Amino acid sequence: ELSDKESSAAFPGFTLDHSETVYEALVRASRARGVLMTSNAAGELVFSRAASTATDELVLGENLLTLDFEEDFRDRFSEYTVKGYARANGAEGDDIDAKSIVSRKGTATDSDVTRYRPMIIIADSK
Amino acid sequence: TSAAVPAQAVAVTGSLGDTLSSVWQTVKDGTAAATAVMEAVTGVIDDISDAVDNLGVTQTVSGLMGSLSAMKGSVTSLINQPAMLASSLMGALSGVSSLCDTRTAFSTWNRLAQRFERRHAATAGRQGTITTSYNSPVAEKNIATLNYVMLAAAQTYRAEAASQALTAALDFSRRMDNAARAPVLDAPTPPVFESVSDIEKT
Amino acid sequence: DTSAAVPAQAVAVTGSLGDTLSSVWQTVKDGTAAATAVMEAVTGVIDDI
Amino acid sequence: AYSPPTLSSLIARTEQNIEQRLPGSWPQAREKTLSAIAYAQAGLAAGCHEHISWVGRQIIPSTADEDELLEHCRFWGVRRKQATAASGPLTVTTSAATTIPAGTRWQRADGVVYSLADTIVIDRAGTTEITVTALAAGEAGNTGENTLLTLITPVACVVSDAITVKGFSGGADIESAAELLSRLEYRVQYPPFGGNQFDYVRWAREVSGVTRAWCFPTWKGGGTVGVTFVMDNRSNIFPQPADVERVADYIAGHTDPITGLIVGQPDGVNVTVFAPKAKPVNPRIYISPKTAELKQAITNAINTMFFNEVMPGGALAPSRIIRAVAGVTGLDDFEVRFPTEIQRSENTELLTAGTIEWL
Amino acid sequence: SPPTLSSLIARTEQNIEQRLPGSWPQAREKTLSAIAYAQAGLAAGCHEHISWVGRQIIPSTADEDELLEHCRFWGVRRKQATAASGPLTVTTSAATTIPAGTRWQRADGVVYSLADTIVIDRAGTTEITVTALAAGEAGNTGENTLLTLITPVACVVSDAITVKGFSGGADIESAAELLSRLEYRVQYPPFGGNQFDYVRWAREVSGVTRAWCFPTWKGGGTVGVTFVMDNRSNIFPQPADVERVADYIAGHTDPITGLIVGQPDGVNVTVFAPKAKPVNPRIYISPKTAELKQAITNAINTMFFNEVMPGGALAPSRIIRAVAGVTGLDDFEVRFPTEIQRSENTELLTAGTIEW
Amino acid sequence: SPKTAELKQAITNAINTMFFNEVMPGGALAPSRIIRAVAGVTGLDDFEVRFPTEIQRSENTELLTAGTIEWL
Amino acid sequence: TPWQTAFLQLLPSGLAWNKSPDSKLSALAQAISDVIATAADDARQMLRERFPSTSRWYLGEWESFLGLPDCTSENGTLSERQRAAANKMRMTGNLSRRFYEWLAAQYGFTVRLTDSTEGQWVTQVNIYGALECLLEKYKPAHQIYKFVYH
């Protein structure tokens, strides 16, 4: 369903661990792509897209029997930094140097948490 | 309602873009019609650039100014392809909207609406004249449609900005409490939308 | 919390005093009595601290 | 300063100020008669702080109220625009070809009076169109299509009926605050326009009627510059000495329509305004299919090419005429016979298309 | 000039005594004194807010946001920051096409992207032009700033060394510079080719620091503008600079209204650079030190920069004031420039070699 | 060069304070100090010190003092 | 006075408090509120001070910002200083004679720019009934002015 230009970027190489379920393989790929995988109402697989227009209203006075609002900050961090290994199998092996093979990095910062609170993530693939 | 205004603004902008591209027609490169169309498109881009330059006194608008400069430089390519022209113009309008805060949105969109209304009135007041007989009909159509579409987009953005300013003012009013409490020693919307007659005039 | 409201106000007072000193200070370019007396006053304050 | 203290803070600090300078210490729960005085003083303080904030919002013209913006405009020199009437055509029919007086009046059903300020004599019984302007300043006096109007005072051999096939147009109310602010900012930010070859074109073209202008700098040596203006709206394309004098007067002195200050030519240089002289060229084109529509199309194409690419002191090759004739595409065979040499002229002579033969 | 706290206290106490006969509010630790002090404090707060409401009427004393608003109203326009461009020497393995969008990152983290696609088949090191993305004064770099590649590309080596440094980075002007420009605009009103207008026109172009205009230069119809540059080494103009300044005065577009404005058509300007007229002074200083030499040279140079113009005179007392302004030295007698020096408008005096 | 009362008063006060600062009994006065004191006024156009061109000296019991300044 | 009435209105309402115009509460309220009355008048003064044509306390700042002190500013008259500041602050125009007559009229004088007598560039200014230096400072760069009094 997505019409992105970067979510459709092809994998330079994607291998399958043996005895891996289809769910495991597709979740592994979708996590790296940023997409979320879901099931349709007719049994299909869907790579869903979040909605854009507000269609309904829920209010406390008219049409609510019970509400529950939990706001916990035991997991949200400030700086997520992901580190991993570069691509060197084959064609890129004649181009990439030795140091940049191992030195890769990426960062995403949150502004809701005000103290230090970092987190480092080992990547999943190349 | 208040939550259903942005969806209608998006639909209006989409419809205007679709009608502009569908109506726009191609013209020959060397004729005077191409010169007139190029001048009108350059003037529209100049108006948008003046708006962004007024915005940039407080912020950094260098990226949008560079995009506008590239669009102005590549005009002759855009005149031939209608879809790209309308898409780029609507993207530039949305980019201008992406820089305006709730304080300046109404003022900037009002200024842009006045600037475009001047051109639309000037180009529509001359319907039948011996000089107007000389201009090619295709160029006149391609200019009138562009002027109308630009004006309509500016006015719709202004209306949405006005609604958002009302929402911000009501949130400011809501911020203050209403319960009875004791004082404690403390140790640490545009003005046109505050009065009640100003809202009526608006 | 009146115990924790004193340092918060003291920080602002110190900042305002520093800003006032920076704004009101005027440079004297001469080497005369004015410059040497300003030197004496500044070195007197450092001595006390 | 900015963000004046809240009324709660004022109340608390005034109560503390009264409490501290007294020997005893007030109990936790009590209703002392100094607390009411402290609250009243805090209210007085909060009232003036708001007054001062409103006063401080009136300095910059971008946030002033309408009255203070009017004061700013009064200081600078910008004058507000009042409401304008609405004018339009009245199609009235007469019985015996009378003369309509200078101030006749029509009435609408709603009760807004329209008036004609002119005198018109009718030659024969028939429908005539006359310009009529409303007597109501606001937008209300602005009718629509096919609106019927009636006379107020009967006139001999005039039927009390007016059709108004084309609706009245106009009806602008007073200027808004944003529009007045934009006009004031235009007046403030517009630059001085010293006499330049480009500026003379605008100054000549601003006069009503003038549609094309040309400026020749260093005409007849340095220190004096020439201009030329032509109005194609009239039947006679070339101007008259009265128009030349009017344009010269406008060049010498006029009030800028956008900025209230006075603009004009430089005091040093000498500006000369001369009407262009016609040097007609007769094409004498041959066309194989002879009919009125093709002749009209060819004449219109030739006139358009002349309007686009002909200036005083310019040459006109016959290739342009050939291309203009060929662009009609409604022909079968055409030939250009008279103009075979490169036509050219000097500054004071302007090329124009003469009487075309064979069509 | 707000009233002082003591004055407000005294006024309130006097009013209390006047309105309640036989009362003495100035008594220590009393209710009337407490009320008087509270009201004096409130009045002082109102007066301080009045002072803040004032002092923003003029942009000279205004705060930052009000200064920006005043600049926007008066028409002075802020200039946005610039990116950093430079030549990048990239090595290649075989024939390939480098698309527009590839990113090269410095060792710090700043990235630079190619704005136009290129094709190469040399199988050797080539040179391209690349511009940054931060668009700030951190963009420009040093002489040889090794940097790697972020987006892998077939048949190209990741590392790349730039030999010529990146330059062109800048920052948005500060409110101080905006205030200076607005103050200049207000202080020198614009006319059509006025004597101040020619100076401001010749100063608007890049490089020029100072310029002067002589009305009726050689006759009744010619005016002459001469400009100098100091940000350089020759501290003077070249024929190309003179030609471009004359072109700018002849014609340029106005950023505000979008139309073109400049010198009138009839008159002629004939810009010309000034001619140096060195003057060599003899100054005796009892202590000799290269630091004192540099200080006295700087003092004389600043004196000349401040109070010397083409066509003007220079009395020896100016040199004596510059020589006496130095703090270190003990004796500052001058011998050579006893008489006054004057020059024609075409030649500007200059502090030549200094004789000690 | 400008003969005005406030300029005369300013020059006199500058000379008085220059005597107050670095003039002690048994000291030496040169025209340099007087010229510097006069130049440090920032209210003049032209000036020239003429009389005390030679170094003034005195013994321990004598103290230099500015007397009557002529022309100002 | 309205300020004492406003202060009295801010007080609690009840049978105890006496707000009659002859009571001690009113007698104290007048003295209490007079200071805020003066402060509010000072704040209202900022309306007029906004312009240099009528400012009194900020004339010094208005002149420093405009670089005012010059020939066209008269000796000491505060009205003359205000007029000079308010005339220089809004000073833009062309070189047309008509504009020069309008400008000389704006400063209180009345002159007519007549044709030349000896040459072409030189223009004669007839003064009927500071001006010399003002016109010599704001004169066109190329032209020359001659002055004749009447």
Curated annotation (Swiss-Prot), chain A:
Disruption phenotype: No tail is synthesized. Induction: Expressed in the late phase of the viral replicative cycle. Expression of late genes is activated by the viral late transcription activator C. It comes from the Viruses. Cleavage of the C-terminus gives rise to a shorter 40 kDa form. It is found in: Virion; Host cytoplasm. Residues 82-101 bind DNA. C-terminal region forms a flexible domain. Forms the central cylindrical hub of the baseplate and plays an important role in baseplate and tail assembly. Core component of the initiator complex that triggers the tail tube polymerization during tail assembly. Forms a conduit that probably functions as an extension of the tail tube allowing viral DNA release during ejection. Might facilitate the interaction of the virus with the host cell surface through electrostatic interactions during virus entry into host cell. Heterotrimer of one uncleaved (42 kDa) and two cleaved (40 kDa) forms. Forms a hub-like structure with an inner diameter of 25 Angstroms through which DNA can presumably pass during infection. Part of a complex composed of three DNA circularization protein N, three baseplate hub protein gp44 and three sub-complex wedge (made of two copies of each baseplate protein gp46, gp47 and gp48) that forms the baseplate. This is Baseplate hub protein gp44.
Curated annotation (Swiss-Prot), chain C:
It comes from the Viruses. Required for tail assembly of phage Mu and responsible for circularizing the viral DNA after it has been ejected into the host cell. Following infection, the circularized DNA can be isolated as a supercoiled, non-covalent protein-DNA complex, in which the protein N is bound to the ends of the DNA. Protects linear double-stranded DNA of viral genome from host exonuclease degradation. This is DNA circularization protein N. The gene is N. Part of a complex composed of three DNA circularization protein N, three baseplate hub protein gp44 and three sub-complex wedge (made of two copies of each baseplate protein gp46, gp47 and gp48) that forms the baseplate. It is found in: Virion; Host cytoplasm. The chain holds residues 150 to 198 of 495 of the full protein. LysM-like fold region might interact with peptidoglycan to facilitate DNA ejection. Disruption phenotype: No tail is synthesized. Induction: Expressed in the late phase of the viral replicative cycle. Expression of late genes is activated by the viral late transcription activator C.
UniProtKB/Swiss-Prot annotation, chain F:
It is found in: Virion; Host cytoplasm. Induction: Expressed in the late phase of the viral replicative cycle. Expression of late genes is activated by the viral late transcription activator C. Disruption phenotype: No tail is synthesized. Part of a complex composed of three DNA circularization protein N, three baseplate hub protein gp44 and three sub-complex wedge (made of two copies of each baseplate protein gp46, gp47 and gp48) that forms the baseplate. Component of the baseplate. Probably involved in tail assembly. Belongs to the Mu gp47/PBSX XkdT family. This is Baseplate protein gp47. It comes from Escherichia phage Mu. The chain holds residues 289 to 360 of 360 of the full protein.
Curated annotation (Swiss-Prot), chain G:
Pfam families: Phage_Mu_Gp48. It comes from Escherichia phage Mu. The keyword Signal does not apply. Component of the baseplate. One of its GO terms (biological process) is viral tail assembly. This is Baseplate protein gp48. Keywords: Host cytoplasm, Late protein, Viral baseplate protein, Viral release from host cell, Viral tail assembly, Viral tail protein, Virion. Disulfide bonds: none annotated. The lineage of its organism: Viruses, Duplodnaviria, Heunggongvirae, Uroviricota, Caudoviricetes. Its main location: virion. Part of a complex composed of three DNA circularization protein N, three baseplate hub protein gp44 and three sub-complex wedge (made of two copies of each baseplate protein gp46, gp47 and gp48) that forms the baseplate. GO terms for cellular component: host cell cytoplasm; virus tail, baseplate. It is found in: Virion; Host cytoplasm. InterPro entries: Phage_Mu_Gp48 (IPR018755).
